[PDB]
Structure formats: structure tokens, C-alpha cells
Amino acid sequence: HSVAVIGAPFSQGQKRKGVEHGPAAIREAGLMKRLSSLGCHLKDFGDLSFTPVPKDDLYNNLIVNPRSVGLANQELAEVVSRAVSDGYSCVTLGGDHSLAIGTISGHARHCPDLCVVWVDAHADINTPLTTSSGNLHGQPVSFLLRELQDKVPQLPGFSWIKPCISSASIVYIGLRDVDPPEHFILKNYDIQYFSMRDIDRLGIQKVMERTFDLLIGKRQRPIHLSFDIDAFDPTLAPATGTPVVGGLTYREGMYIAEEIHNTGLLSALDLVEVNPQLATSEEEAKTTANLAVDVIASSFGQTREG
Amino acid sequence: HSVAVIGAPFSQGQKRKGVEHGPAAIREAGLMKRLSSLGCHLKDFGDLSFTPVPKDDLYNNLIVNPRSVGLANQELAEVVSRAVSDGYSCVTLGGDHSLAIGTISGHARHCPDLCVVWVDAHADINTPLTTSSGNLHGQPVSFLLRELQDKVPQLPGFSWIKPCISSASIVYIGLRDVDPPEHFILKNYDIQYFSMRDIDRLGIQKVMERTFDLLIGKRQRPIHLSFDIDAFDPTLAPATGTPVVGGLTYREGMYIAEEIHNTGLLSALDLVEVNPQLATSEEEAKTTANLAVDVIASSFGQTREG
Amino acid sequence: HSVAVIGAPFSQGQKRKGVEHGPAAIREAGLMKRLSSLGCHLKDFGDLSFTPVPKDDLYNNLIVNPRSVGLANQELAEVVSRAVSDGYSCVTLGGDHSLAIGTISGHARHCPDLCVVWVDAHADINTPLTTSSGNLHGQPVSFLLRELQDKVPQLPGFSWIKPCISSASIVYIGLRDVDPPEHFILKNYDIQYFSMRDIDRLGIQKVMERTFDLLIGKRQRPIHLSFDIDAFDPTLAPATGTPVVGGLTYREGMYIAEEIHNTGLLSALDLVEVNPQLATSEEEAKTTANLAVDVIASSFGQTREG
Numbered sequence: 074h075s076v077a078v079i080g081a082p083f084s085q086g087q088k089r090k091g092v093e094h095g096p097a098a099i100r101e102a103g104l105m106k107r108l109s110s111l112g113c114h115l116k117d118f119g120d121l122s123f124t125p126v127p128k129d130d131l132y133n134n135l136i137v138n139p140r141s142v143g144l145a146n147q148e149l150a151e152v153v154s155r156a157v158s159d160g161y162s163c164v165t166l167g168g169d170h171s172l173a174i175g176t177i178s179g180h181a182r183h184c185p186d187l188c189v190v191w192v193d194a195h196a197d198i199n200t201p202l203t204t205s206s207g208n209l210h211g212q213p214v215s216f217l218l219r220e221l222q223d224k225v226p227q228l229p230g231f232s233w234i235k236p237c238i239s240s241a242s243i244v245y246i247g248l249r250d251v252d253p254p255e256h257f258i259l260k261n262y263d264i265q266y267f268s269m270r271d272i273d274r275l276g277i278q279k280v281m282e283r284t285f286d287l288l289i290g291k292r293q294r295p296i297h298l299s300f301d302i303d304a305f306d307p308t309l310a311p312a313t314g315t316p317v318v319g320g321l322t323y324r325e326g327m328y329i330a331e332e333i334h335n336t337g338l339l340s341a342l343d344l345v346e347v348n349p350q351l352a353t354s355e356e357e358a359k360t361t362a363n364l365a366v367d368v369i370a371s372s373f374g375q376t377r378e379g
Numbered sequence: 380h381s382v383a384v385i386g387a388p389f390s391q392g393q394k395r396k397g398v399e400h401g402p403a404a405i406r407e408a409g410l411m412k413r414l415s416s417l418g419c420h421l422k423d424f425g426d427l428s429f430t431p432v433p434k435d436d437l438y439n440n441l442i443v444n445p446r447s448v449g450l451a452n453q454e455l456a457e458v459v460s461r462a463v464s465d466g467y468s469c470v471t472l473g474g475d476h477s478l479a480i481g482t483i484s485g486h487a488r489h490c491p492d493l494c495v496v497w498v499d500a501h502a503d504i505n506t507p508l509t510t511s512s513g514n515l516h517g518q519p520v521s522f523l524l525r526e527l528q529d530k531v532p533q534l535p536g537f538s539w540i541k542p543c544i545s546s547a548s549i550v551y552i553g554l555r556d557v558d559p560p561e562h563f564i565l566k567n568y569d570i571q572y573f574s575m576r577d578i579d580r581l582g583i584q585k586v587m588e589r590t591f592d593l594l595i596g597k598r599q600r601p602i603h604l605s606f607d608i609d610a611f612d613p614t615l616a617p618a619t620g621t622p623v624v625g626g627l628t629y630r631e632g633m634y635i636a637e638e639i640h641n642t643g644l645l646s647a648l649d650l651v652e653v654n655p656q657l658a659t660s661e662e663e664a665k666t667t668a669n670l671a672v673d674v675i676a677s678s679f680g681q682t683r684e685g
Numbered sequence: 686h687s688v689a690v691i692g693a694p695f696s697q698g699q700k701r702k703g704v705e706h707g708p709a710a711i712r713e714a715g716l717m718k719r720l721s722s723l724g725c726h727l728k729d730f731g732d733l734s735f736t737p738v739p740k741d742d743l744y745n746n747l748i749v750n751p752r753s754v755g756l757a758n759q760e761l762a763e764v765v766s767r768a769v770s771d772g773y774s775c776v777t778l779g780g781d782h783s784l785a786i787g788t789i790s791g792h793a794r795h796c797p798d799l800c801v802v803w804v805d806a807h808a809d810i811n812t813p814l815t816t817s818s819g820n821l822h823g824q825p826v827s828f829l830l831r832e833l834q835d836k837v838p839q840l841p842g843f844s845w846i847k848p849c850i851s852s853a854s855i856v857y858i859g860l861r862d863v864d865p866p867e868h869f870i871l872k873n874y875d876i877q878y879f880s881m882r883d884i885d886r887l888g889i890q891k892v893m894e895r896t897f898d899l900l901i902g903k904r905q906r907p908i909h910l911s912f913d914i915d916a917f918d919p920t921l922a923p924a925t926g927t928p929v930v931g932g933l934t935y936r937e938g939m940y941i942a943e944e945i946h947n948t949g950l951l952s953a954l955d956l957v958e959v960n961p962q963l964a965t966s967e968e969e970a971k972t973t974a975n976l977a978v979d980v981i982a983s984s985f986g987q988t989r990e991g
């Protein structure tokens with residue numbers, strides 16, 4: 074099996090410095106050797122250098138770096154599309170979660186029936202009209218869902234984007250910090266999610282069983298796993314931009330990834346929002362990067378029983 | 380929906396200095412803004428000043444500060460009774476857990492059919508004849524339960540207390556540090572409880588289901604939630620006087636509070652035993668205070684999915 | 686009603702210094718008083734001094750200290766056999782896990798129909814032909830299981846060992862760091878195990894139920910509990926030689942011990958691999974030793990509900 078690794082050192086989906094160093098931190102934590110050890114044939118695309126945009130002024134005096142985020146995601150989408158074309162499962166290292174616009178667009182280009190597992194403390198589904206931060210890393214899903222497009226105005230640099238996913242084709246796992254307009258969107262478009270509360274009730278084994286019944290119970294589909302490291306409790310993943318108490322345990326995160334691998338359908342994976350600069354110690358930065366590597370490795374077959 | 384907040388800075392139910400600063404620490408952690416944000420209309424009664432009793436000698440050369448605990452609880456009960464009659468759900472901030480004598484007596488004064496959910500590492504059900512510490516914060520339930528009163532002698536300053544509640548009307552959640560005479564009492568009077576072991580077996584969802592079926596399965600009753608911060612594992616709630624390893628997780632504490640809110644019946648809440656002076660660091664004190672606010676907020680409707 | 690305590694301060698099953706101070710550390714954390722309070726009549730054999738072997742060269746240029754480990758276990762087996770013969774449940778404090786060769790051989794010498802519950806992050810079932818470390822604490826099970834013996838060469842100092850326990854008579858709980866040859870052995874011999882993943886799926890209550898169904902579902906048998914402290918998550922048991930992320934919680938460990946007690950069949954217990962020199966602080970050392978005392982005390986009747 075063949076896996077392409079793409080560093081996407083992007084930070085302009087939000088305002089905190091340092092998430093552009095996530096890809097190097099994850100690499101420094103041993104990613105490539107771990108993937109090789111599993112039998113993965115590897116193509117390293119390196120870290121992309123995204124084309125800047127001069128005078129990328131706020132959109133509507135709120136939305137930050139719109140043209141830079143639109144253009145970086147267009148370029149990323151091109152690399153993901155071509156790698157998925159050439160037979161690779163695509164691992165994209167971030168970088169902030171606005172990059173999911175690019176990886177899911179590029180993925181869907183060649184696999185239009187793909188489904189999405191979004192593992193995250195946050196829903197990332199604000200629109201340009203509901204965001205209260207202006208940060209695109211909290212809006213990427215709104216640009217991707219067919220059913221929402223009449224409520225998403227067109228941003229400078231975003232005209233290449235055509236939503237390719239139905240709201241029935243994404244499931245969230247781990248929600249615990251949702252804005253009211255996001256909650257409204259989830260309920261109003263009947264988007265399925267398992268919050269931390271649902272995990273407390275069902276247990277992660279049932280959560281995964283129901284996730285796959287919703288997504289692939291009728292038919293096999295390529296799976297896009299978009300994993301925000303802040304889905305994990307901050308005690309485990311402290312080096313990240315928007316930590317929220319009461320997250321996944323280590324064991325729960327491994328279990329999610331093991332179940333992803335067990336479908337045999339994993340086609341692309343994002344590992345986003347590792348920001349080593351927000352660690353208060355080198356150890357905090359390395360434990361976060363090591364946890365990122367554990368997620369990716371388990372998603373491609375690393376087991377706890379050997 | 381109206382919420383009264385009462386500071387009860389009492390420490391004479393036990394011997395460790397500093398729990399009288401519990402109410403200020405909780406207020407400082409942002410309680411009042413959190414309750415407003417949920418839509419609660421608030422009346423802050425401030426921090427009560429309890430009348431001292433001169434020459435409050437030990438009772439039976441063992442029980443410490445009996446008259447002061449008795450009189451402070453008499454005064455607290457009056458405030459609680461008044462706030463309930465004016466339509467407020469009553470939040471009392473402690474302070475050591477002997478204040479539940481006052482809040483439950485005042486609550487039961489005009490709601491004699493109330494039920495009690497007692498969240499705690501301890502049963503607090505020693506009598507003056509079984510306590511080996513002499514600390515009234517470890518005896519409050521013995522004064523409240525009608526079936527026990529033939530076995531509870533009359534302490535100086537306690538004559539105003541009339542046990543209003545049946546032993547079928549209290550459920551414990553989180554027990555893990557129980558004296559042999561307390562275990563006898565729980566068994567002998569058939570008092571229902573879910574120890575940490577029961578949570579390990581059943582899961583917190585079923586624990587709450589069985590709690591409400593036992594208490595409100597046949598009729599709606601105002602709920603008194605007496606929440607001792609030491610129900611949480613000491614890694615989460617270190618700033619407290621009697622910590623015991625193996626406690627509730629954060630998620631379990633939130634889930635309890637969420638289910639309390641979901642009944643619609645919460646009528647009074649005690650948040651006791653936060654002692655900021657027992658934290659070894661400012662960060663330990665503040666995480667303990669912040670956890671207290673999360674419990675209260677979740678008990679009045681804060682959710683994890685927005 | 687009677688418990689023997691044997692200190693086995695052995696370190697030559699592995700290469701890290703200090704695990705020979707496990708027994709003293711566990712005793713200093715209050716083991717004997719805790720056992721007495723449960724009503725255990727106690728015989729303390731102290732710490733054994735094992736006979737050295739001159740010129741104990743590597744076996745096959747790989748296996749370290751073979752004769753010293755063999756002889757020390759022969760001597761330990763003799764002490765365990767006598768204690769079990771005289772009516773004592775035998776508690777052996779390690780020391781590295783190669784001592785289970787001695788404690789299980791000595792136990793079986795008096796109770797041949799014993800069964801084994803092996804709580805560990807590791808399977809410890811490498812043979813001299815599969816070990817990649819050469820450390821005998823990672824091989825003890827291979828010397829004990831009847832079905833494996835054609836694949837186990839005879840080591841100098843090991844000829845006294847009579848391996849008559851069946852592979853159907855051991856169950857593992859907690860596995861998460863298993864070598865590929867150990868995985869092959871476990872599958873090829875149909876040895877039953879509950880990995881951390883199984884615990885994630887089933888919950889520790891069902892794990893224990895199924896463990897006892899496999900071992901004592903048809904008849905009562907004396908139970909040998911061999912408990913490697915590194916089964917627990919490293920955050921709870923840091924002072925140990927091979928820590929592995931994602932282990933048992935405190936509550937899961939207590940629950941295992943409680944169910945061991947509840948069978949009424951506990952006949953011997955090993956508490957191994959506490960190495961206080963690997964703690965980065967005195968706090969980490971004492972937390973690990975206190976956890977070891979909790980495991981042993983719970984295995985002999987300490988409950989969380991009193």
C-alpha cells in the first residue's frame with residue numbers, strides 16, 4: 074500500500090503564530106519511520122510553499138487572510154488530487170484546519186462518493202456570516218457541504234471552490250465547544266455528530282459502529298479522516314491553538330484510528346492544529362507531536378496487540 | 380428562571396484552615412457571568428456572616444464547634460427557606476459540608492417532599508456516636524434522616540433541627556472512602572448509593588438513570604444537589620481538605636450535572652469543600668475553582684454541544 | 686486468613702538498576718499495616734538473599750544472567766512452596782518479572798491445578814529464540830507453559846523447571862506492547878488475552894467476567910495473580926522500567942484486584958517491576974509504591990465502599 078505525506082505549513086486560517094511548524098514537529102517525532110515499519114510505501118512531497126497574496130485585506134472587515142487561504146487551498150487541492158490519482162492514500166500534516174478545504178476538494182475531485190469523519194472539539198462549520206472570530210479554520214465545513222451553499226457568500230480567492238459533499242456524508246466525533254449558530258446549522262441540516270456527551274453515554278465502540286453505519290452501511294466509500302489534535306484532552310495535546318477541557322482519552326483516540334484502519338477504506342487523512350510554539354515546555358511540544366504520530370500510525374494499521 | 384447565590388464561608392465543620400475562602404474563589408472564577416449567560420436571573424445574597432457562639436466547648440470531649448455549626452446552619456436555613464419561597468433556585472457556595480444541614484433544612488421547610496442527590500467521595504453519615512474525627516462535616520446526613528433519629532443524640536445548638544427526609548429520599552454518587560459504621564448505616568437503612576465501583580460497572584449514564592428512577596420514578600420532586608468537590612479525582616480538584624484517589628473524571632462530573640439539569644427539577648445546589656489554601660500552587664487553586672463553576676453552570680443548563 | 690510476604694529483590698532479569706529496591710519501597714508505603722487491618726495474619730519472610738553464580742556468561746551471546754536468574758528462581762520457588770504448603774496466600778514483591786518463574790513454579794509445586802491471571806502491558810512470552818532484548822523478565826511465561834516446551838531450549842540453571850501449566854490456564858489483561866513473535870505464539874497456541882483495546886470495547890467488568898469464565902467457569906481453582914505495575918498508565922505508575930502509554934486507569938486496576946478477591950480463590954500474588962530509581966522525583970517514587978500497596982490490599986479485600 075502507498076501513502077503520500079504532504080506538509081502543509083499554513084497558519085493564516087487563524088491568528089496564533091506557530092502552527093505552520095506542525096509538519097516539521099510531526100516529522101521530527103518519527104512519522105516516516107513509523108509508516109515505513111507498517112509496510113507503507115512512502116512518497117514524501119516535502120512541505121509545500123504556498124504562493125502569498127499581496128495586500129490580502131480583511132473581507133467584510135472581519136474575515137482574515139481570505140485570498141491567502143483560498144489560494145493555498147487551491148494549490149494544496151491540486152497536490153492532493155494528483156497524489157490520489159497516482160494511487161496514494163494522502164496524509165496531510167498541518168497547519169491550521171482551514172487546509173481541509175483543500176484536502177477534501179482535491180480528494181473529492183477523484184473520489185466524489187467520499188465520506189468524511191471529522192474528529193474535533195469543534196464543528197468548524199461557521200459561515201462567513203456566522204463566524205464571530207473571523208478565522209477561516211472555524212469555517213471550512215461550511216464551504217464543503219452542498220446543502221449550505223445558498224447561505225455561504227463568495228469570498229475573494231474562493232471562486233474555484235465547489236462544494237462536493239452532502240451533509241449526510243460527514244460525521245463528527247468529539248464535539249464540546251460549538252457556537253450557537255453552528256449548533257443551529259447541525260440541527261437544521263440534520264448533520265450527525267457524537268459529542269463528548271454521546272461518547273460518555275455510548276462508549277467509543279458504539280460511536281464508531283454507528284458512525285460507519287451512517288456512512289458506509291449501504292455501500293463502500295473512500296473515507297476522509299480529518300483529525301484535529303484538539304479533539305484530545307488538553308492534558309494529552311497541550312500544544313494547540315484552542316484547547317478545550319474534557320476531550321478524548323489516549324485510548325479513545327487510538328480506538329477511533331484503529332476502527333478507521335479496520336474499514337480498509339481510508340483514502341486521505343488530515344492531522345491538523347499541532348502548534349509546538351504554544352507548548353510551555355519542550356516536553357509538552359514533543360508529547361503532542363508524538364500523539365499526532367500515534368494517530369496517523371494507528372490509522373494505517375499500528376495495533377495495540379502487535 | 381431565577382437563581383439565588385449564597386456564600387456560606389464556614390470552616391468550623393472541620394479543622395483545616397481556608398475552606399471559608401471557597402465562596403470567594405468560586406466567585407472569582409467567573410460564576411456570576413456564567414450563570415447570567417445561560418439566562419439565569421440572579422440575586423446575590425453575598426457572603427453571609429454567621430453569629431459566633433462564645434465558649435463553644437467540645438461536645439462529649441469529641442465533637443468540635445457544635446453550637447457554632449448549629450447556629451450558623453440555623454441562620455443559613457432561614458436564608459435558604461426565604462429564597463426558595465421567593466421562587467429562587469438556591470446555589471450555596473461553601474465552606475465545609477456541614478452547611479448542608481442548614482441548606483437542606485431550609486429547603487425542606489416548605490418542600491418536605493424534596494429528594495437529595497449527594498455527590499461525594501464520602502457518605503458524611505457518621506452520627507455523633509460513630510464519628511472518629513469529631514468533625515461535623517462528616518456527620519451532616521445523620522441529622523437529616525428521619526429513620527436515624529433514635530440513634531442521634533441532641534447536640535448543643537441543634538435543637539431547632541427536625542429531620543424531614545426519609546432514607547429512601549437520598550442517593551449517593553461517587554463513594555470511595557467510607558467508615559465501617561457508615562457502611563453499616565447505609566446497609567441497615569437500605570440507603571441507595573453508587574460507589575466508584577458501581578460507576579466502573581454501570582457507566583455514569585445508567586447511574587443517573589437509576590438515580591432518578593429511585594427518586595422521581597413515581598412523582599416529580601424538587602431536587603437538592605449537594606456536590607462535594609472531592610467527588611472529583613484529586614488530579615482535577617486538588618484544593619480540598621480530604622482528597623481520595625480514584626474519583627470522578629471531568630466528563631463524569633459534567634454528565635451528572637447535565638442530567639440534573641435535564642430533569643427540570645433542580646431547586647437547590649450546594650458546592651462545598653473548595654479550600655484554596657490547600658492548593659500547592661495558584662494554578663491548582665484556580666483549576667479547582669474553575670471546576671466548581673463548570674459544575675454549577677452545567678447544573679443550570681450549560682451543555683457540551685451548544 | 687493467612688498471608689506470607691516475600692521480598693524478591695531481583696534485577697538480573699533485565700538491565701536497568703534499581704528494581705531490586707521495589708520490595709523495600711513497597712514495604713515503606715505501608716503494606717503490612719494495610720494487610721493486617723484487613724484481618725490478614727501475617728508472616729514476613731523479609732527480603733531473600735539469592736546465591737550468586739560465578740562467571741554467569743551470556744547464553745548464546747544474547748541471554749543475560751541465565752544461571753543467576755535460574756538459581757534465584759529455584760531458591761524463590763522453594764520459599765514459595767513451603768509458604769503455600771503451610772497455609773499462606775503468598776505475596777511476592779519484585780524485583781523484575783523473571784521472578785514469576787520462581788513464584789509460579791513454587792506455587793504449582795503445591796497447587797498443580799492453579800490458573801494464572803497476568804496483568805501487564807507486555808506478554809512476557811518471548812522464548813530464548815524469539816527475544817530481541819535477551820532480558821529474561823520478557824520471557825518468563827515461555828518457561829512455564831507445557832505446550833511451548835519443544836520450542837524452548839534448555840538454559841544453564843533452568844533444568845530444575847518442570848513446566849506443566851497449560852496454555853489454557855493463563856489469561857492476560859492489559860496488553861499493549863507485544864512483539865510480533867509473541868503475537869504469533871499467543872495466536873498459535875490459542876492463549877486468551879484482553880488487550881487495552883478489548884478493555885476499551887468490553888469494559889473491565891465484562892473483561893473480568895470472561896476471564897473467570899475461561900479459568901474457573903468449569904471448576905474452582907487456586908488463582909495466581911501476577912501483576913506487573915506497568916499495566917497501569919505511566920501517569921499513575923511512572924517508576925518502572927518499560928512504561929507504555931495508554932494503560933489501566935487507577936479504577937480499572939482496583940476493579941481487577943477487587944474481582945480477584947471476590948472469587949475467594951486468590952492463592953498467590955506477584956507485584957513486580959516497581960523501580961524507584963527511575964522516578965524523576967520522590968513524589969513519583971512514592972505514588973508508584975502506594976499504587977502497588979493499593980493493588981495488593983484490594984486483592985485481599987480492601988473495597989471502595991467500606
Ligand SMILES: N[C@@]1(C(=O)O)CN(C[C@@H]2CCCCN2)C[C@@H]1CCC[B-](O)(O)O
Nearest residue numbers: 170195197199206208210211252315346
Ligand atoms: N468556533 C470557533 C471559531 O473561531 O469559529 C470559536 N472558538 C471556540 C471558542 C468558543 C467559545 C469560547 C471562545 N471561542 C474556536 C472555534 C474555531 C476552532 C477551529 B479549529 O480547527 O481548532 O477547530
Ligand SMILES: N[C@@]1(C(=O)O)CN(C[C@@H]2CCCCN2)C[C@@H]1CCC[B-](O)(O)O
Nearest residue numbers: 476501503505510512514516517558621
Ligand atoms: N468519614 C470522615 C469523617 O470525618 O467522618 C473521616 N475522613 C475519611 C478518612 C477515612 C480513612 C482514614 C482517614 N479519614 C473524612 C470523612 C469526612 C469527610 C467530610 B466531607 O464533607 O469532605 O465529605
Ligand SMILES: N[C@@]1(C(=O)O)CN(C[C@@H]2CCCCN2)C[C@@H]1CCC[B-](O)(O)O
Nearest residue numbers: 782807809811818820822823862864927
Ligand atoms: N518484549 C520485551 C522484551 O524485552 O522481551 C521488549 N520490551 C519493550 C519493547 C520496546 C520497544 C519495541 C517493542 N517493545 C519490553 C518487553 C519485556 C517486558 C518485561 B516486563 O516484565 O516489564 O513485562
Ligand SMILES: [Mn+2]
Nearest residue numbers: 170193197301
Ligand atoms: Mn478543527
Ligand SMILES: [Mn+2]
Nearest residue numbers: 194195301303
Ligand atoms: Mn478544533
Ligand SMILES: [Mn+2]
Nearest residue numbers: 476499503607
Ligand atoms: Mn462531603
Ligand SMILES: [Mn+2]
Nearest residue numbers: 500501607609
Ligand atoms: Mn467528601
Ligand SMILES: [Mn+2]
Nearest residue numbers: 806807913915
Ligand atoms: Mn510489563
Ligand SMILES: [Mn+2]
Nearest residue numbers: 782805809913
Ligand atoms: Mn511483566
